[PDB]
Write a protein that binds this DNA or RNA. Structure first.
Length: 535
DNA sequence: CGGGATGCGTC
DNA sequence: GTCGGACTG
DNA sequence: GCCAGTCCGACGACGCATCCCG
């Protein structure tokens, strides 16, 4: 009983093709809705509808996919590579799927979406090239091409239809989206909607041990701005340059979710099962929202961002990892997402005991009047602490919603900055495609008197300006001057960009400087200096 | 057996 | 993390 | 016309894991 029409790739594709060819979200979700109501497996169509939200790792991508299919097709992998420049592997494959006077497409579309899901599962367990090519072949040899194309889009986590979770889930129930954010497990949502739809003839609760879409922070560009959105005053916390960790604990089972709700790599969380119970006497269950950091144990100071790597962790003889708890969503079987922050933070202090260098309250001063805030921004840029995170006081806990504020030096107006020389180019993928979307930014060096690399750059430019840029730029084609102001959070060091080892955290481009055609742009020792002033 | 590619996941 | 560009009410 | 609240895609540096293939 998986053999009805609604379970066919052909129909699934129909669905995908329709939604993409229809630019209003209102109608996109309507489309899905009609389909789920009129005309088949519910869980799977919604799941397959969200390859980028319900992610399975295949260890494949443009490069490898092309390698492996040139093998099954018996054709030249150079030609496919040129075709990768239009920026869509799915299309690139389908085209090279009739060319094969050796591996021809199937006669008719006969795949049931269960088989595609069962396939993807088993694909995801593969890791050696041999095994993958096989699997891929097993499936590919049952595909209308139309089929195959779709199925590599699934592999690629992107159905190119402009409908993400919100819009797909809205077809499922007035509250599916909201409910999903509070307990982020699709199968459970559907099970719940089908138990509801059952009894005729959907409540948004958080569930202990299953992830909650963490609450988010909006970029806030001025004090004026922050003041407006916190009409009740705010709590100002220091912005930990760490990794967000949501802790769930149930009796003595502990689980640790990351920002993306993936489990946290155990080497940065394995030791907390030991402290938390001491941090929280008589808290059998709870869900905490925190940041994890590697702390310098001999000085109290936290260590910079990269430092959370296993081998980096390992270099320091001073530190183990530490947790800064800045929120509490749930505790002893009761959700607190609805309570206002001011009440939640109160509960924290009222129930947690700080344990030295492991489990730590995040420091949050009340701020209430503009001047007092603007001082704090200055006070904190001073010793290069990343920024601030400001939260309204009466605010409740709203999963997934960007309602907190984050402030950092590069936002107001004060930003780390380099007027860099553009050298090279790369093709963009998709919407941007067959174009020079990305750019290679570097500096001249009077040392070896050769040119030098600092960071790539894509952001900054609007669509209208990008297409004009297609012309004004010289033609470095070999894959085997002009000058831009680029702008980032900081300046980083590592053994990868030729320039001594320096680079830009979140490189963006701001000004297009029509003045300083080389020579006046930055050179190695100049930048070498720039970096060091931030220390 | 060890460099090179490719991919993943954290900001 | 960044950014530019959309659809909604 | 305009908003603001939110999505959606198309992207960066770093640190790391695993497989390849000579």
């Amino acid at each position: 009983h998986m053999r009805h029409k609604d379970c066919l790739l052909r129909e699934f594709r129909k669905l995908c093709a329709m939604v993409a060819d229809n630019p209003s979200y209102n109608t996109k979700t309507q489309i899905i809705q009609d389909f789920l109501r009129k005309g088949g497996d519910v869980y799977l169509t919604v799941k397959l509808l969200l390859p980028g939200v319900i992610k399975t790792v295949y260890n494949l991508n443009d490069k490898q996919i092309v390698k492996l299919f040139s093998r099954i097709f018996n054709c030249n992998p150079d030609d496919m590579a040129r075709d990768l420049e239009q920026g869509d592997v799915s299309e690139t494959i389908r085209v090279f799927f009739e060319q094969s006077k050796s591996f021809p497409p199937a006669a008719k579309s006969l795949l049931t979406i269960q088989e595609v899901d069962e396939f993807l599962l088993r694909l995801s367990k593969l890791t050696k090239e041999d095994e993958q090519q096989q699997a891929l072949q097993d499936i590919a040899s049952r595909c209308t091409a139309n089929d195959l194309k779709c199925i590599i889009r699934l592999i690629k986590h992107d159905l190119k239809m402009n409908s993400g979770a919100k819009h797909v889930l809205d077809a499922l129930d007035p509250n599916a989206y909201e409910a999903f954010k509070a307990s982020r497990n699709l199968q459970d949502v559907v099970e719940r909607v089908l138990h509801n739809a059952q009894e005729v003839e959907l409540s948004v609760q958080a569930s202990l041990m299953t992830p909650v879409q963490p609450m988010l922070a909006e970029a806030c560009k001025s004090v004026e701005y922050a003041m407006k959105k916190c009409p009740n005053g705010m709590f100002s916390e220091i912005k930990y340059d760490g990794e967000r960790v949501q802790v769930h604990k149930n009796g003595d089972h502990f689980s640790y979710f990351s920002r993306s709700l993936k489990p946290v790599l155990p080497h940065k969380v394995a030791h907390f099962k030991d402290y938390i119970p001491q941090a929280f006497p008589g808290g059998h269950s709870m869900i905490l929202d925190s940041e994890v950091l590697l702390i310098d144990n001999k000085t109290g100071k936290p260590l910079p961002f990269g430092t959370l790597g296993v081998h980096k962790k390992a270099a320091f003889q001073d530190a183990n990892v530490c947790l800064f708890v800045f929120d509490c969503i749930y505790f002893n079987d009761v959700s607190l997402m609805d309570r206002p922050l001011c009440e939640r933070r109160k509960f924290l202090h009222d129930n947690m005991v700080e344990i030295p260098n492991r489990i730590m309250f995040s420091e949050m001063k009340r701020v209430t009047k503009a001047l007092d805030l603007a001082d704090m921004i200055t006070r904190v840029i001073q010793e290069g602490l990343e920024g601030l995170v400001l939260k309204d006081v009466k605010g409740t806990y709203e999963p997934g919603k960007r309602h907190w504020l984050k402030v950092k030096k590069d936002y107001l107006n004060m930003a780390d900055t380099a007027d860099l020389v553009v050298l090279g180019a790369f093709y963009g993928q998709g919407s941007k495609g067959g174009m020079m979307s990305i750019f290679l930014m570097g500096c001249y060096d009077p040392g070896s008197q050769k040119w030098c690399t600092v960071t790539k750059c894509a952001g900054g430019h609007d669509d209208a300006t990008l297409a004009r840029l297609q012309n004004e730029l010289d033609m470095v084609k070999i894959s085997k001057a002009a000058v831009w102001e680029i702008t980032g959070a900081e300046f980083s060091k590592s053994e990868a960009h030729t320039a001594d080892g320096i680079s830009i955290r979140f490189p963006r481009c701001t000004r297009i400087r029509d003045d300083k055609d080389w020579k006046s742009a930055t050179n190695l020792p100049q930048l070498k200096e720039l970096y060091q002033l931030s220390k």
